[PDB]
Protein backbone atom coordinates (compact mmCIF):
# COMPACT_ATOMS: atom_id res chain seq x y z
CA UNK A 1 0.00 0.00 0.00
CA UNK A 2 1.20 3.51 -0.84
CA UNK A 3 0.00 4.85 2.52
CA UNK A 4 2.25 2.47 4.45
CA UNK A 5 5.27 3.51 2.38
CA UNK A 6 4.30 7.17 2.86
CA UNK A 7 4.22 6.73 6.64
CA UNK A 8 7.55 4.89 6.35
CA UNK A 9 9.28 7.71 4.46
CA UNK A 10 7.67 10.20 6.86
CA UNK A 11 9.30 8.45 9.82
CA UNK A 12 12.54 8.19 7.82
CA UNK A 13 12.58 11.97 7.35
CA UNK A 14 11.73 12.30 11.04
CA UNK A 15 14.78 10.21 11.94
CA UNK A 16 16.91 12.23 9.51
CA UNK A 17 15.85 15.59 10.98
CA UNK A 18 16.13 14.29 14.57
CA UNK A 19 19.84 15.18 14.36
CA UNK A 20 18.97 18.86 13.83
CA UNK A 21 17.24 19.06 17.25
CA UNK A 22 19.19 16.50 19.29
CA UNK A 23 22.52 18.11 18.34
CA UNK A 24 21.37 21.69 18.98
CA UNK A 25 23.98 23.68 20.91
CA UNK A 26 22.48 26.19 23.39
CA UNK A 27 24.21 29.13 25.03
CA UNK A 28 26.85 27.57 27.27
CA UNK A 29 29.55 28.52 29.77
CA UNK A 30 31.85 26.59 32.07
CA UNK A 31 31.40 26.14 35.82
CA UNK A 32 32.16 29.31 37.79
CA UNK A 33 32.44 29.45 41.59
CA UNK A 34 30.61 32.79 41.79
CA UNK A 35 27.61 31.51 39.77
CA UNK A 36 26.97 27.81 40.54
CA UNK A 37 28.24 27.31 44.11
CA UNK A 38 26.40 27.83 47.41
CA UNK A 39 24.94 31.14 48.58
CA UNK A 40 28.43 32.23 49.71
CA UNK A 41 29.02 33.60 46.19
CA UNK A 42 27.14 36.81 47.07
CA UNK A 43 22.77 39.62 44.24
CA UNK A 44 22.88 40.97 40.66
CA UNK A 45 23.67 37.72 38.79
CA UNK A 46 24.41 39.67 35.60
CA UNK A 47 27.22 41.56 37.36
CA UNK A 48 28.66 38.29 38.69
CA UNK A 49 28.53 36.76 35.20
CA UNK A 50 30.25 39.84 33.76
CA UNK A 51 33.03 39.90 36.36
CA UNK A 52 33.48 36.11 36.21
CA UNK A 53 33.51 35.65 32.41
CA UNK A 54 35.15 37.98 29.84
CA UNK A 55 33.25 39.15 26.75
CA UNK A 56 33.36 37.09 23.59
CA UNK A 57 31.58 36.72 20.25
CA UNK A 58 28.57 38.91 19.47
CA UNK A 59 29.53 41.12 22.45
CA UNK A 60 28.33 38.26 24.70
CA UNK A 61 30.21 36.65 27.60
CA UNK A 62 32.90 34.33 26.27
CA UNK A 63 31.56 30.78 26.06
CA UNK A 64 35.13 29.43 26.25
CA UNK A 65 36.94 31.57 28.87
CA UNK A 66 36.49 32.09 32.62
CA UNK A 67 38.23 34.35 35.13
CA UNK A 68 40.24 32.70 37.91
CA UNK A 69 39.76 35.78 40.10
CA UNK A 70 36.81 38.21 40.12
CA UNK A 71 37.72 41.13 37.86
CA UNK A 72 36.06 44.03 39.67
CA UNK A 73 37.71 46.54 37.31
CA UNK A 74 35.12 45.83 34.59
CA UNK A 75 32.17 46.34 36.96
CA UNK A 76 32.97 49.94 37.90
CA UNK A 77 32.10 52.34 35.04
CA UNK A 78 34.88 54.75 36.05
CA UNK A 79 37.51 52.20 34.99
CA UNK A 80 38.47 51.52 31.38
CA UNK A 81 36.59 48.68 29.73
CA UNK A 82 38.38 45.61 28.33
CA UNK A 83 41.32 46.24 30.66
CA UNK A 84 41.77 42.60 31.71
CA UNK A 85 44.74 40.59 30.45
CA UNK A 86 44.71 37.27 28.62
CA UNK A 87 46.68 35.54 31.39
CA UNK A 88 43.81 36.14 33.84
CA UNK A 89 41.69 33.51 32.05
CA UNK A 90 41.63 29.71 32.10
CA UNK A 91 40.77 27.36 29.20
CA UNK A 92 37.19 26.75 30.41
CA UNK A 93 38.23 23.64 32.30
CA UNK A 94 35.76 23.32 35.19
CA UNK A 95 33.05 21.78 32.98
CA UNK A 96 30.22 23.48 31.15
CA UNK A 97 26.64 24.31 32.13
CA UNK A 98 23.78 24.76 29.66
CA UNK A 99 20.44 26.57 29.71
CA UNK A 100 17.54 24.15 30.20
CA UNK A 101 14.93 26.62 28.94
CA UNK A 102 14.56 25.51 25.32
CA UNK A 103 16.12 22.03 25.49
CA UNK A 104 16.31 19.95 28.67
CA UNK A 105 19.02 17.57 27.44
CA UNK A 106 20.94 17.30 24.16
CA UNK A 107 23.98 15.44 22.87
CA UNK A 108 25.92 18.71 23.03
CA UNK A 109 25.11 19.27 26.71
CA UNK A 110 25.66 15.62 27.66
CA UNK A 111 29.11 14.93 26.18
CA UNK A 112 30.29 18.58 26.43
CA UNK A 113 30.47 19.42 22.72
CA UNK A 114 32.36 22.67 23.23
CA UNK A 115 34.88 24.90 21.43
CA UNK A 116 37.67 22.37 21.96
CA UNK A 117 35.49 19.63 20.41
CA UNK A 118 33.09 21.76 18.34
CA UNK A 119 34.05 19.71 15.27
CA UNK A 120 32.40 16.62 16.80
CA UNK A 121 28.84 17.53 15.80
CA UNK A 122 29.76 18.05 12.12
CA UNK A 123 31.94 14.95 12.47
CA UNK A 124 28.92 13.11 13.88
CA UNK A 125 26.79 14.21 10.93
CA UNK A 126 29.58 13.18 8.55
CA UNK A 127 29.78 9.75 10.20
CA UNK A 128 26.00 9.42 9.87
CA UNK A 129 26.15 10.29 6.17
CA UNK A 130 29.11 7.95 5.62
CA UNK A 131 27.03 5.21 7.21
CA UNK A 132 24.24 6.16 4.81
CA UNK A 133 26.66 5.82 1.89
CA UNK A 134 27.94 2.44 3.13
CA UNK A 135 24.41 1.13 3.66
CA UNK A 136 23.22 2.28 0.24
CA UNK A 137 26.27 0.68 -1.38
CA UNK A 138 25.84 -2.56 0.58
CA UNK A 139 22.08 -3.18 0.43
CA UNK A 140 22.17 -3.54 -3.36
CA UNK A 141 23.59 -7.07 -3.56
CA UNK A 142 21.82 -7.92 -0.29
CA UNK A 143 18.41 -6.95 -1.69
CA UNK A 144 19.23 -8.69 -4.98
CA UNK A 145 20.18 -11.96 -3.24
CA UNK A 146 17.95 -12.25 -0.16
CA UNK A 147 14.97 -10.44 -1.67
CA UNK A 148 13.63 -6.97 -1.00
CA UNK A 149 11.17 -7.87 1.77
CA UNK A 150 13.74 -9.73 3.88
CA UNK A 151 16.27 -6.89 3.79
CA UNK A 152 13.41 -4.44 4.36
CA UNK A 153 12.37 -6.21 7.57
CA UNK A 154 16.02 -6.48 8.63
CA UNK A 155 16.50 -2.75 8.04
CA UNK A 156 13.38 -1.97 10.08
CA UNK A 157 14.63 -4.17 12.93
CA UNK A 158 18.07 -2.54 12.79
CA UNK A 159 16.50 0.93 12.75
CA UNK A 160 14.45 0.14 15.85
CA UNK A 161 17.36 -1.48 17.69
CA UNK A 162 19.83 1.31 16.95
CA UNK A 163 17.25 3.94 17.87
CA UNK A 164 16.54 2.39 21.26
CA UNK A 165 20.31 1.95 21.69
CA UNK A 166 21.29 5.54 20.88
CA UNK A 167 18.44 6.71 23.12
CA UNK A 168 20.59 5.49 26.05
CA UNK A 169 24.12 5.85 24.69
CA UNK A 170 26.59 6.27 27.60
CA UNK A 171 29.51 7.45 25.46
CA UNK A 172 30.11 9.55 22.35
CA UNK A 173 31.87 6.87 20.23
CA UNK A 174 29.12 4.38 21.12
CA UNK A 175 26.51 6.94 20.05
CA UNK A 176 28.45 7.51 16.82
CA UNK A 177 28.50 3.77 16.08
CA UNK A 178 24.78 3.51 16.87
CA UNK A 179 24.08 6.39 14.48
CA UNK A 180 26.30 4.72 11.86
CA UNK A 181 24.27 1.50 12.05
CA UNK A 182 21.00 3.45 12.12
CA UNK A 183 22.10 5.26 8.95
CA UNK A 184 23.05 1.93 7.37
CA UNK A 185 19.51 0.68 7.98
CA UNK A 186 18.06 4.03 6.85
CA UNK A 187 19.91 3.81 3.54
CA UNK A 188 18.80 0.21 3.14
CA UNK A 189 15.12 1.00 3.66
CA UNK A 190 15.44 4.09 1.45
CA UNK A 191 16.92 2.10 -1.43
CA UNK A 192 14.21 -0.53 -0.92
CA UNK A 193 11.45 2.10 -1.04
CA UNK A 194 12.97 3.62 -4.17
CA UNK A 195 13.41 0.35 -6.06
CA UNK A 196 9.89 -0.66 -4.99
CA UNK A 197 8.08 2.54 -5.98
CA UNK A 198 9.96 2.88 -9.28
CA UNK A 199 8.24 -0.27 -10.59
CA UNK A 200 5.19 -0.95 -8.37
CA UNK A 201 2.79 1.17 -10.44
CA UNK A 202 4.70 2.33 -13.53
CA UNK A 203 3.25 6.53 -16.64
CA UNK A 204 2.48 7.13 -12.96
CA UNK A 205 6.18 7.21 -12.02
CA UNK A 206 6.31 11.05 -11.71
CA UNK A 207 3.14 10.98 -9.60
CA UNK A 208 4.60 8.30 -7.32
CA UNK A 209 7.86 10.22 -6.97
CA UNK A 210 6.02 13.45 -6.16
CA UNK A 211 3.97 11.54 -3.57
CA UNK A 212 7.20 10.19 -2.07
CA UNK A 213 8.71 13.68 -1.85
CA UNK A 214 5.48 15.05 -0.36
CA UNK A 215 5.66 12.24 2.20
CA UNK A 216 9.04 13.43 3.33
CA UNK A 217 7.86 16.98 3.40
CA UNK A 218 5.13 15.66 5.70
CA UNK A 219 7.92 13.92 7.60
CA UNK A 220 9.69 17.26 8.04
CA UNK A 221 6.42 18.77 9.24
CA UNK A 222 5.69 15.95 11.68
CA UNK A 223 9.20 15.89 13.14
CA UNK A 224 8.96 19.65 13.72
CA UNK A 225 5.99 19.18 16.05
CA UNK A 226 7.53 16.02 17.54
CA UNK A 227 10.67 17.92 18.53
CA UNK A 228 8.52 20.80 19.78
CA UNK A 229 6.53 18.43 22.01
CA UNK A 230 9.32 16.54 23.79
CA UNK A 231 12.34 18.43 25.12
CA UNK A 232 14.58 15.42 25.89
CA UNK A 233 16.60 13.90 23.05
CA UNK A 234 16.46 10.44 24.64
CA UNK A 235 12.65 10.34 24.79
CA UNK A 236 12.63 12.00 21.36
CA UNK A 237 14.63 9.19 19.77
CA UNK A 238 12.60 6.61 21.72
CA UNK A 239 9.22 7.89 20.49
CA UNK A 240 10.65 8.29 16.99
CA UNK A 241 11.96 4.70 16.83
CA UNK A 242 8.79 3.23 18.39
CA UNK A 243 6.82 3.63 15.11
CA UNK A 244 9.47 1.45 13.47
CA UNK A 245 8.89 -1.24 16.10
CA UNK A 246 5.19 -0.91 15.27
CA UNK A 247 5.75 -1.16 11.51
CA UNK A 248 7.90 -4.26 12.08
CA UNK A 249 4.60 -6.13 12.61
CA UNK A 250 4.21 -6.26 8.80
CA UNK A 251 7.20 -8.62 8.52
CA UNK A 252 6.70 -11.48 6.02
CA UNK A 253 3.29 -9.95 5.20
CA UNK A 254 1.87 -10.95 8.60
CA UNK A 255 3.51 -14.39 8.19
CA UNK A 256 1.63 -15.09 4.93
CA UNK A 257 -1.62 -14.09 6.69
CA UNK A 258 28.77 -3.92 -13.69
CA UNK A 259 27.19 -1.06 -15.66
CA UNK A 260 30.54 0.77 -15.78
CA UNK A 261 29.85 2.13 -19.29
CA UNK A 262 28.20 5.25 -17.81
CA UNK A 263 31.53 7.12 -17.65
CA UNK A 264 32.63 6.88 -21.33
CA UNK A 265 29.14 6.96 -22.85
CA UNK A 266 27.27 10.27 -22.50
CA UNK A 267 30.08 11.74 -20.42
CA UNK A 268 28.65 15.27 -20.46
CA UNK A 269 25.20 14.06 -19.43
CA UNK A 270 26.49 11.85 -16.61
CA UNK A 271 28.84 14.48 -15.19
CA UNK A 272 26.08 17.11 -15.29
CA UNK A 273 23.63 14.76 -13.55
CA UNK A 274 26.18 13.80 -10.89
CA UNK A 275 27.01 17.48 -10.38
CA UNK A 276 23.36 18.42 -9.82
CA UNK A 277 22.85 15.47 -7.46
CA UNK A 278 26.03 16.33 -5.54
CA UNK A 279 24.89 19.96 -5.30
CA UNK A 280 21.43 19.05 -4.01
CA UNK A 281 22.81 16.63 -1.42
CA UNK A 282 25.51 19.05 -0.27
CA UNK A 283 23.19 22.05 0.05
CA UNK A 284 20.36 20.10 1.69
CA UNK A 285 22.41 18.21 4.27
CA UNK A 286 24.43 21.34 5.01
CA UNK A 287 21.43 23.63 5.43
CA UNK A 288 18.80 21.29 6.91
CA UNK A 289 21.05 20.38 9.87
CA UNK A 290 21.81 23.89 11.21
CA UNK A 291 18.38 25.55 11.37
CA UNK A 292 19.45 27.26 14.62
CA UNK A 293 21.53 29.76 12.62
CA UNK A 294 19.13 30.07 9.68
CA UNK A 295 16.26 31.38 11.82
CA UNK A 296 15.26 32.56 15.28
CA UNK A 297 12.90 29.67 16.16
CA UNK A 298 13.86 26.22 14.89
CA UNK A 299 10.38 24.70 15.25
CA UNK A 300 8.58 27.55 13.46
CA UNK A 301 11.35 27.57 10.84
CA UNK A 302 10.85 23.87 10.09
CA UNK A 303 7.06 24.29 10.06
CA UNK A 304 7.31 27.13 7.54
CA UNK A 305 9.82 25.10 5.51
CA UNK A 306 7.32 22.25 5.25
CA UNK A 307 4.23 24.37 4.62
CA UNK A 308 6.01 26.24 1.80
CA UNK A 309 7.76 23.17 0.35
CA UNK A 310 4.49 21.22 0.02
CA UNK A 311 2.93 23.50 -2.65
CA UNK A 312 6.28 24.17 -4.34
CA UNK A 313 6.97 20.47 -4.90
CA UNK A 314 3.28 20.01 -5.74
CA UNK A 315 3.48 22.51 -8.61
CA UNK A 316 6.90 21.15 -9.55
CA UNK A 317 5.20 18.39 -11.55
CA UNK A 318 3.00 20.93 -13.34
CA UNK A 319 6.14 22.90 -14.20
CA UNK A 320 7.90 19.76 -15.43
CA UNK A 321 4.93 18.84 -17.63
CA UNK A 322 4.39 22.35 -19.04
CA UNK A 323 7.75 24.13 -19.33
CA UNK A 324 10.03 21.08 -19.61
CA UNK A 325 12.70 19.36 -17.55
CA UNK A 326 15.89 21.41 -17.93
CA UNK A 327 14.45 24.98 -17.78
CA UNK A 328 12.41 24.56 -14.59
CA UNK A 329 15.31 22.69 -12.95
CA UNK A 330 17.76 25.48 -13.80
CA UNK A 331 15.25 28.09 -12.61
CA UNK A 332 14.73 26.32 -9.28
CA UNK A 333 18.48 25.87 -8.78
CA UNK A 334 19.17 29.53 -9.54
CA UNK A 335 16.33 30.64 -7.25
CA UNK A 336 17.62 28.51 -4.38
CA UNK A 337 21.17 29.77 -4.90
CA UNK A 338 20.08 33.41 -5.01
CA UNK A 339 17.92 32.95 -1.91
CA UNK A 340 20.76 31.36 0.07
CA UNK A 341 23.14 34.11 -1.10
CA UNK A 342 20.68 36.83 -0.06
CA UNK A 343 20.41 35.04 3.29
CA UNK A 344 24.05 36.04 3.79
CA UNK A 345 23.54 39.44 2.15
CA UNK A 346 20.68 40.37 4.51
CA UNK A 347 21.82 41.48 7.99
CA UNK A 348 21.21 39.11 10.89
CA UNK A 349 18.78 41.56 12.52
CA UNK A 350 16.12 40.82 9.87
CA UNK A 351 15.23 37.46 11.37
CA UNK A 352 11.91 37.16 9.53
CA UNK A 353 13.59 37.85 6.18
CA UNK A 354 16.37 35.38 6.98
CA UNK A 355 13.81 32.70 7.87
CA UNK A 356 11.82 33.38 4.69
CA UNK A 357 14.97 33.19 2.56
CA UNK A 358 16.00 29.90 4.19
CA UNK A 359 12.52 28.46 3.63
CA UNK A 360 12.59 29.55 -0.01
CA UNK A 361 16.04 28.02 -0.48
CA UNK A 362 14.93 24.71 1.02
CA UNK A 363 11.85 24.67 -1.21
CA UNK A 364 14.05 25.43 -4.20
CA UNK A 365 16.53 22.64 -3.50
CA UNK A 366 13.63 20.24 -2.95
CA UNK A 367 12.14 21.23 -6.30
CA UNK A 368 15.57 20.79 -7.89
CA UNK A 369 15.79 17.31 -6.36
CA UNK A 370 12.38 16.49 -7.85
CA UNK A 371 13.46 17.74 -11.28
CA UNK A 372 16.77 15.86 -11.27
CA UNK A 373 14.99 12.67 -10.16
CA UNK A 374 12.55 13.07 -13.05
CA UNK A 375 15.38 13.86 -15.48
CA UNK A 376 17.48 10.85 -14.45
CA UNK A 377 14.90 8.55 -16.06
CA UNK A 378 15.06 10.43 -19.39
CA UNK A 379 18.64 11.70 -19.87
CA UNK A 380 19.92 8.13 -20.28
CA UNK A 381 18.49 5.32 -22.45
CA UNK A 382 17.25 2.03 -21.04
CA UNK A 383 20.65 0.43 -21.69
CA UNK A 384 22.34 2.75 -19.18
CA UNK A 385 19.37 3.61 -16.92
CA UNK A 386 23.27 2.44 -13.24
CA UNK A 387 23.09 6.16 -13.97
CA UNK A 388 20.48 6.75 -11.26
CA UNK A 389 22.61 4.78 -8.82
CA UNK A 390 25.70 6.83 -9.68
CA UNK A 391 23.68 10.02 -9.24
CA UNK A 392 22.42 8.88 -5.84
CA UNK A 393 25.98 7.97 -4.85
CA UNK A 394 27.21 11.42 -5.88
CA UNK A 395 24.36 12.97 -3.87
CA UNK A 396 25.41 11.16 -0.78
CA UNK A 397 28.98 12.04 -1.28
CA UNK A 398 27.86 15.66 -1.42
CA UNK A 399 25.80 15.07 1.71
CA UNK A 400 28.87 13.62 3.44
CA UNK A 401 30.98 16.62 2.43
CA UNK A 402 28.19 18.95 3.61
CA UNK A 403 28.96 19.16 7.33
CA UNK A 404 32.71 19.14 6.60
CA UNK A 405 32.44 22.60 5.04
CA UNK A 406 30.65 23.92 8.14
CA UNK A 407 34.02 23.89 9.93
CA UNK A 408 34.87 27.04 7.92
CA UNK A 409 32.71 29.02 10.36
CA UNK A 410 35.86 29.94 12.29
CA UNK A 411 37.04 32.09 9.37
CA UNK A 412 33.56 33.59 9.07
CA UNK A 413 29.93 32.80 9.90
CA UNK A 414 28.86 33.38 6.28
CA UNK A 415 31.40 31.14 4.50
CA UNK A 416 29.38 27.88 4.83
CA UNK A 417 26.21 29.67 3.73
CA UNK A 418 28.23 31.42 1.01
CA UNK A 419 29.20 28.01 -0.37
CA UNK A 420 25.63 26.72 0.08
CA UNK A 421 24.46 29.64 -2.06
CA UNK A 422 27.24 29.60 -4.65
CA UNK A 423 27.05 25.87 -5.44
CA UNK A 424 23.42 25.89 -6.74
CA UNK A 425 24.15 28.87 -9.00
CA UNK A 426 26.97 27.03 -10.79
CA UNK A 427 24.85 23.86 -10.75
CA UNK A 428 22.03 25.61 -12.59
CA UNK A 429 24.46 27.30 -14.98
CA UNK A 430 25.88 23.87 -15.84
CA UNK A 431 22.47 22.20 -16.12
CA UNK A 432 21.33 24.95 -18.52
CA UNK A 433 23.47 23.20 -21.18
CA UNK A 434 21.43 19.98 -21.00
CA UNK A 435 19.73 18.86 -24.26
Ligand SMILES: CCc1oc2ccccc2c1C(=O)c1cc(Br)c(O)c(Br)c1
Nearest residue numbers: 016132190213216217280281395396399
Ligand atom coordinates in the same frame (compact mmCIF):
# COMPACT_ATOMS: atom_id res chain seq x y z
C1 LIG B 1 14.02 9.74 -1.19
C2 LIG B 1 15.24 10.59 -0.83
C3 LIG B 1 14.80 11.92 -0.25
O1 LIG B 1 13.78 12.64 -0.63
C4 LIG B 1 13.65 13.77 0.12
C5 LIG B 1 12.73 14.84 0.07
C6 LIG B 1 12.83 15.86 1.00
C7 LIG B 1 13.88 15.86 1.93
C8 LIG B 1 14.78 14.82 1.96
C9 LIG B 1 14.64 13.79 1.04
C10 LIG B 1 15.35 12.61 0.79
C11 LIG B 1 16.50 12.28 1.63
O2 LIG B 1 16.36 12.39 2.78
C12 LIG B 1 17.79 11.87 1.00
C13 LIG B 1 18.23 10.58 1.15
C14 LIG B 1 19.43 10.22 0.58
BR1 LIG B 1 20.18 8.45 0.72
C15 LIG B 1 20.15 11.14 -0.12
O3 LIG B 1 21.34 10.68 -0.66
C16 LIG B 1 19.72 12.43 -0.27
BR2 LIG B 1 20.79 13.71 -1.26
C17 LIG B 1 18.52 12.80 0.30
